[PDB]
Structure 1
Amino acid sequence: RPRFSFSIAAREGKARTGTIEMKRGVIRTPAFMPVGTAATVKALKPETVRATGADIILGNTYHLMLRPGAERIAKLGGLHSFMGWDRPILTDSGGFQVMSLSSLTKQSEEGVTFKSHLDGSRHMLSPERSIEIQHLLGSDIVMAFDECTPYPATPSRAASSMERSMRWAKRSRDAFDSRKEQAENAALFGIQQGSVFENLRQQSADALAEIGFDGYAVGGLAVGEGQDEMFRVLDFSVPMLPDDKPHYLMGVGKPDDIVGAVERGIDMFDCVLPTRSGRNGQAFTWDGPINIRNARFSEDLKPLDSECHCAVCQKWSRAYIHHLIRAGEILGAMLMTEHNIAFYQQLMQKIRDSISEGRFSQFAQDFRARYF
């Protein structure tokens, strides 16, 4: 396979379906990427993640650089070897997590300095260090280092942040290109910023296209603006990005959000919703999510979802999983997580098929009618 090749096989309105070919494997789009926070997709062996249908997973740079550490992972052979996942891995730049998980952060045009939330160590993340860490991890899809804009944001602040992000996009591109091994085996995605302002989104899109990237992400959304507003911004923002490259909506994972985003041209997604929901006890079903801890499921012999083809729904009852979660058993988390990730992958598969068959619109309608 090539270093990177995105091909669109079918379209319906703004929706697209196709594949991204990379050295470590093929990625079917629209794609949902399970999140592997600390070199592990919570409660699942990599083979199980693959069994659900995942083609690629996401790795958090912020978390990994803190522990076990980027250099350490490199010395151990890279992230793939370390965690046992041999297919593509997309790594975020770490910027977002730094501004929401660490403390005593010091921002400047050079980058950001912060103290770990684990202990009291300091770090100086920048476009160059972020790209370097992603190289050390052996990431397949590298994200440019940006400065995220909090919501709500004033035009002035959003412009300043977006402008700095574009300068950082150029620095990220050059850093990536200067490292022969990385430039020849990995791909680089740029991130569009600009908050909810159309003119800023346009300037960002133009700056990113001018530099040139393998893929373009829509950053700065799903940060508190609500679906209505998010959809409104996607309406004019996605068309601004190069049509022949993947469109990645970062941090978006609610089923309905995904369907709406695909309807607006998005090709890639990632979110902890699936996995985290395996904590409180939320299980996704085509009839909407259910909280398995609820007493009504204590003697329910049916599977989590009546149609789901995952191993969990083939072998265990809601009653059993209900018991497991209420008892705080690890198997409870393992089963809930496997089911939720499988559910998301089945959602993506139904989306890909409907688009390829020119019936995505009807699928979106039918999906919403039953899910709500």
Structure 2
Amino acid sequence: RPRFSFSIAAREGKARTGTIEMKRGVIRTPAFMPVGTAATGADIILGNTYHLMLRPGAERIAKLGGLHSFMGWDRPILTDSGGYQSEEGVTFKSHLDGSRHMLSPERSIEIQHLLGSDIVMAFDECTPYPATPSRAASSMERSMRWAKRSRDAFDSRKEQAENAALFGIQQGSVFENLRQQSADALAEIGFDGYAVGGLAVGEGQDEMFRVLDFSVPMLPDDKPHYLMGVGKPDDIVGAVERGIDMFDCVLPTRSNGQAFTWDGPINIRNARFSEDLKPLDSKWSRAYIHHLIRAGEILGAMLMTEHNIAFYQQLMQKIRDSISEGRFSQFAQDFRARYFA
């Protein structure tokens, strides 16, 4: 396999389905990327850089052979840049041990190099919401300067440049002109993939979709589009309808008794499930999972998490199949009707 190749196999409206080929495997898109520590299907997993920086540290991970060996996962891994202050970067103190840490585009790339990830994120600034036009512009402009520094740091590390891929992150808050300037700057630098940053930060689904409507077409069509921090199943479907190819979200693993189902989210702890013999996956019964989680049994939490990860992967498979078959619009309509019934 090549270091990085993205190929679009089929399209319906703005939606696309295809593959990213990398040295460690093929990623089918649209893709959901689960947190790698969530459970023992997914073509790529996430490593949480911020956490790994603090425990056990990137140098220790490298000493143990890198994240692939450490976690027992031989397929692609994506890491964030750690930033989610000055022009140089950000400084912060660790609550775990008081140790001092600085983070900059250069240090972020080096941390991700030591972790050994396959998809490396440029170091950006996620602009808070809401933001004034002036503050969104200033933040986006800094992120673009940091994207160039990330590009140069990545290219100066031969093993990384030859074996990994680098994604740039579009910013600009909710402002069309700033999103355009950001897309132009990123395309001029040149990246393997393009993330839509700065969303899922409190703006709500209608506003997020509005921003995606104009923002995704500004990115290079022939490269993957990654919507960071999204999301709920209905967010994913609507974002695919708007041209997004890749997703990450803490929700399936964070979801406390919450299970995702084709009939919407449910809280399995609710007493209405205490005698419900229907399987959670529409074959442990809802009643048994309810019992385990109400009893505080770790098995219940593990089964819930596995159910949610599996639900998300079944959702992505149905999305990919329906786009490839030219019935994604109908799938999206049927999905929403049942999920929100």
TM-score (norm 2): 0.98
Alignment identity in percent?
100
Within 2, Cα distance between the matches of 1:118 and 1:361? Answer: 48
User: What SS does the aligned partner of 2:281 have?
Assistant: coil
Within 1, Cα distance between the matches of 2:179 and 2:97? Answer: 37
Alignment-derived partner of residue 320 in structure 1: 288
List per-residue Cα deviations over 1:15-57 (Å, max 9, x = no partner).
Answer: 0000000011000000000023699xxxxxxxxxxxx901001
Deviation at 1:70, TM superposition (A): 0.1
Checking the alignment, whether the CA contact within 8 Å between 1:12 and 1:360 is kept in structure 2 is yes
Deviation at 1:302, TM superposition (A): 1.2
List per-residue Cα deviations over 1:115-136 (Å, max 9, x = no partner).
Answer: 1233322200000000000000
How many residue pairs align between the two structures?
Answer: 340
List per-residue Cα deviations over 1:304-323 (Å, max 9, x = no partner).
Answer: 132xxxxxxxx311111101
Shift of the 31–38 alpha-carbon distance from structure 1 to 2, 3 Å rule, reads closer
Alignment-derived partner of residue 33 in structure 1: 33
Shift of the 352–235 alpha-carbon distance from structure 1 to 2, 3 Å rule, reads same
Checking the alignment, whether the CA contact within 8 Å between 1:324 and 1:332 is kept in structure 2 is yes
User: What SS does the aligned partner of 1:86 have?
Assistant: coil
List per-residue Cα deviations over 1:243-280 (Å, max 9, x = no partner).
Answer: 00000000001000000000000000000100010xx1
Structure 1 gaps of 5+ residues are 40-51, 97-106, 307-314
User: What SS does the aligned partner of 1:350 have?
Assistant: helix
Within 2, Cα distance between the matches of 1:370 and 1:355? Answer: 19
**Is 1:58 aligned to 2:54, yes or no?**
no
Checking the alignment, whether the CA contact within 8 Å between 2:38 and 2:253 is kept in structure 1 is no
Checking the alignment, whether the CA contact within 8 Å between 1:38 and 1:67 is kept in structure 2 is no
Within 1, Cα distance between the matches of 2:235 and 2:296? Answer: 30
Deviation at 1:207, TM superposition (A): 0.2
Deviation at 1:301, TM superposition (A): 1.2
Checking the alignment, whether the CA contact within 8 Å between 1:34 and 1:271 is kept in structure 2 is yes
Shift of the 326–38 alpha-carbon distance from structure 1 to 2, 3 Å rule, reads closer
Checking the alignment, whether the CA contact within 8 Å between 1:93 and 1:130 is kept in structure 2 is yes
Shift of the 68–218 alpha-carbon distance from structure 1 to 2, 3 Å rule, reads same
List per-residue Cα deviations over 1:42-94 (Å, max 9, x = no partner).
Answer: xxxxxxxxxx9010011111110100110000011000100111110000001
Checking the alignment, whether the CA contact within 8 Å between 1:38 and 1:60 is kept in structure 2 is no
Within 1, Cα distance between the matches of 2:37 and 2:151? Answer: 25
Checking the alignment, whether the CA contact within 8 Å between 1:194 and 1:220 is kept in structure 2 is yes
User: What SS does the aligned partner of 2:247 have?
Assistant: strand
Checking the alignment, whether the CA contact within 8 Å between 2:38 and 2:305 is kept in structure 1 is no
Superposition misfits of 4+ residues, deviation over 4 angstroms = none
Matches within 5 A, 1:1-372: 1-36=1-36, 53-96=41-84, 107-277=85-255, 280-306=256-282, 315-372=283-340
Shift of the 37–219 alpha-carbon distance from structure 1 to 2, 3 Å rule, reads farther
User: What SS does the aligned partner of 2:17 have?
Assistant: strand
Shift of the 345–38 alpha-carbon distance from structure 1 to 2, 3 Å rule, reads closer
Which of 135-144 and 54-63 deviates more? 54-63
User: What SS does the aligned partner of 1:16 have?
Assistant: strand
Shift of the 38–73 alpha-carbon distance from structure 1 to 2, 3 Å rule, reads farther
Within 2, Cα distance between the matches of 1:325 and 1:67? Answer: 29
User: What SS does the aligned partner of 1:189 have?
Assistant: strand
Within 2, Cα distance between the matches of 1:231 and 1:187? Answer: 27
User: What SS does the aligned partner of 1:188 have?
Assistant: strand
Within 1, Cα distance between the matches of 2:281 and 2:66? Answer: 37
Checking the alignment, whether the CA contact within 8 Å between 1:144 and 1:169 is kept in structure 2 is yes
User: What SS does the aligned partner of 2:10 have?
Assistant: strand
Checking the alignment, whether the CA contact within 8 Å between 1:302 and 1:317 is kept in structure 2 is yes
Deviation at 1:327, TM superposition (A): 1.1
Checking the alignment, whether the CA contact within 8 Å between 1:8 and 1:18 is kept in structure 2 is yes
Checking the alignment, whether the CA contact within 8 Å between 1:56 and 1:88 is kept in structure 2 is yes
- State the superposition RMSD in angstroms: 1.2
List per-residue Cα deviations over 1:85-116 (Å, max 9, x = no partner).
Answer: 111000000111xxxxxxxxxx0000000112
Checking the alignment, whether the CA contact within 8 Å between 1:38 and 1:63 is kept in structure 2 is no
Checking the alignment, whether the CA contact within 8 Å between 2:228 and 2:248 is kept in structure 1 is yes
Shift of the 38–28 alpha-carbon distance from structure 1 to 2, 3 Å rule, reads closer
Checking the alignment, whether the CA contact within 8 Å between 1:6 and 1:244 is kept in structure 2 is yes
Checking the alignment, whether the CA contact within 8 Å between 1:321 and 1:336 is kept in structure 2 is yes
Shift of the 354–303 alpha-carbon distance from structure 1 to 2, 3 Å rule, reads same
Deviation at 1:163, TM superposition (A): 0.2
Checking the alignment, whether the CA contact within 8 Å between 1:37 and 1:63 is kept in structure 2 is no
Checking the alignment, whether the CA contact within 8 Å between 1:283 and 1:336 is kept in structure 2 is yes
Within 2, Cα distance between the matches of 1:139 and 1:212? Answer: 19
